[PDB]
Ligand binder design. Structure first.
Ligand SMILES: COc1ccc2c(c1OCc1ccccc1)C[C@@H](C(=O)O)N(C(=O)C(c1ccccc1)c1ccccc1)C2
Ligand SMILES: CCCCCCCC/C=C\CCCCCCCC(=O)OC[C@H](O)CO
Ligand SMILES: CCCCCCCC/C=C\CCCCCCCC(=O)OC[C@H](O)CO
Ligand SMILES: CCCCCCCC/C=C\CCCCCCCC(=O)OC[C@H](O)CO
Ligand SMILES: CCCCCCCC/C=C\CCCCCCCC(=O)O
Ligand SMILES: CCCCCCCC/C=C\CCCCCCCC(=O)O
Ligand SMILES: CCCCCCCC/C=C\CCCCCCCC(=O)O
Length: 407
């Protein structure tokens, strides 16, 4: 007897019609749908409870269900005439109006691309070249290297390739933003380069974790080169890319171009099943926090504080303090650079999830989330500019200062 419940009754009876053999089954399902549509018509949308009954938005709201009942009656006519297949075809027209509802009222849409800043496209390209240069230096340095590479370098290389490949998609999103969320590259490049981003970004976050584990292993076990298993890197590297691949599978199944009518543009969005669009957006958002921040941060944090106590356990010399503090400074940078770059995006992601769940119905809050999302998304890309400084460039100084305190 609620708007959310009235739409579940409708989309559930839509399925009954699609799998039916006689017109009596269709007639029965359509009868329930007509009652739900009329009842839903008497349900103010929760996100705009403030708006008065006669506001033009509540006029278009109740009107959407008049179009719906009109289609439900046209199908009932065919079903009463024993035209089961004709009625089923008419029910396809209902999914078209149901799609119009979830865009207009369900989610962020009820509160436009006309919040466009010229800065974002400028900033996105700035990070692109800056990141592509520092990361093309990381890989090229390996050519000029003069020493024995530890398994750590394997993670440095894979971290840079992922950073380069995800940074390589920044021009797509800068142009996508400059054209007010109107995808021009085609429907295949939205599903492809949309998942390709999520793929390399999970890989980037998963390899950052491998680095924090390896460095924690380096402090607790000084003889780690011999202590290692030669095959471990041969197993860990494939495993990371596969975990990143599995983590981005939802993007590949759903990421596709869909036409936003009221905006008149072709957007590259997550095309969830409309009958469960809110539940997926909330669920997928929460898996972004867990797999992409919570679980990762549990490793970096544990590895850091595990390094911190070990260094505090060895000695207390006044000079060795300098060598041990520089290691703590370098271990404290990866953990801080990760939360500074990623905590903004994931907080907004969690809040957006609380919106799809119905907790945050404030439009002023949802507007702030939408206005701050492109900047938070940029800090995520920025950690790809900070990774070269955190590992590669300070990689020679890390190994040396452990061999000093382990003399
Ligand atoms: C056609 O668009 C887009 C398709 C797919 C994606 C995005 C996108 O939006 C991009 C966009 C930017 C600017 C303007 C318009 C769009 C952005 C982002 C997201 O969930 O929302 N995303 C990501 O994998 C995340 C992410 C989060 C957790 C763990 C791994 C990856 C991401 C966040 C921040 C920085 C990089 C990656 C895929
Ligand atoms: C963000 C919320 C949770 C993710 C991070 C959870 C924080 C994990 C803390 C791990 C930790 O504190 O390490 C334990 C101990 O200090 C080691 O010796
Ligand atoms: C933008 C800045 C806002 C800051 C918000 C950060 C959000 C992440 C929260 C915690 C991650 C770190 C976990 C901290 C847990 C402390 C563990 C600890 O203190 O361990 C002591 C050690 O064991 C001695 O014996
Ligand atoms: C290896 C371990 C990996 C762990 C894997 C992480 C996956 C995410 C886990 C839990 C989130 C569950 C979210 C599902 C619930 C979605 C919200 C919902 O259904 O409710 C919507 C709302 O009620 C309508 O108004
Ligand atoms: C703007 C880019 C976002 C911030 C990037 C790097 C800052 C974090 C690096 C570590 C800061 C201090 C480290 C320390 O002294 O322990
Ligand atoms: C970045 C900050 C992250 C905050 C931690 C939140 C972690 C959430 C983890 C699992 C979500 C649990 C289930 C989600 C709510 C149940 C669905 C519902 O209530 O309808
Ligand atoms: C380009 C955007 C900024 C990139 C890097 C700046 C942050 C470098 C911080 C180094 C911390 C010092 C240390 O690790 O000991």
């Amino acid at each position: 007897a609620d708007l959310e419940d009235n739409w579940e009754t409708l989309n559930d009876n839509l399925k009954v019609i699609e799998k039916a053999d006689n017109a009596a089954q269709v007639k029965d399902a359509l009868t329930k749908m007509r009652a739900a549509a009329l009842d839903a018509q008497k349900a103010t949308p929760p996100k705009l409870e403030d708006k008065s009954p006669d506001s033009p938005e509540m006029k278009d709201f109740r009107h959407g269900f008049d179009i719906l009942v009109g289609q439900i009656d046209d199908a009932l006519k065919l079903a009463n005439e024993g035209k089961v297949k004709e009625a089923q075809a008419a029910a396809e027209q209902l999914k078209t109006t149901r799609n119009a509802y979830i865009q207009k009222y369900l989610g962020s849409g009820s509160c436009p691309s006309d919040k466009h800043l010229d800065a974002i496209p400028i900033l996105y390209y700035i990070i692109f070249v800056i990141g592509f240069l520092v990361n093309i230096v990381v890989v090229t340095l390996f050519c000029c290297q003069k020493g024995p590479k530890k398994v750590s370098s394997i993670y440095i290389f894979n971290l840079a390739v992922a950073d380069l490949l995800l940074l390589a998609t920044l021009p797509l999103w800068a142009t996508y933003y400059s054209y007010r969320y109107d995808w021009l590259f085609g429907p295949v490049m939205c599903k492809v380069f949309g998942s390709f981003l999520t793929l390399n970004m999970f890989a980037s976050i998963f390899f950052i974790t491998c680095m924090s584990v390896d460095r924690y292993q380096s402090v607790i076990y000084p003889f780690l080169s011999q202590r290692r298993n030669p095959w471990q890197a041969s197993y860990i590297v494939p495993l990371v890319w596969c975990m990143a691949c599995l983590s981005s599978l939802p993007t590949f199944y759903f990421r596709d171009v869909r036409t936003i009518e009221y905006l008149g543009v072709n957007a590259c969005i997550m095309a969830f099943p409309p009958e469960k669009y809110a539940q997926w957006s909330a669920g997928i958002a929460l898996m972004k926090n867990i797999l992409g921040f919570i679980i990762p941060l549990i490793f970096i944090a544990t590895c850091y504080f595990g390094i911190r106590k070990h260094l505090l356990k060895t000695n207390s010399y006044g000079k060795n303090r300098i060598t041990r503090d520089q290691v703590l400074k370098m271990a404290a940078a990866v953990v801080l650079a990760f939360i500074i770059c990623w905590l903004p995006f994931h907080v907004l992601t969690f809040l957006d999830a609380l919106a799809w769940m119905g907790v945050i119905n404030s439009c002023e809050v949802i507007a702030v989330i939408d206005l701050a999302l492109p900047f938070a998304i940029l800090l995520g890309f920025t950690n790809s500019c900070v990774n070269p400084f955190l590992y590669c460039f300070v990689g020679n100084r890390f190994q040396q200062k452990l061999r000093s305190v382990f003399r």
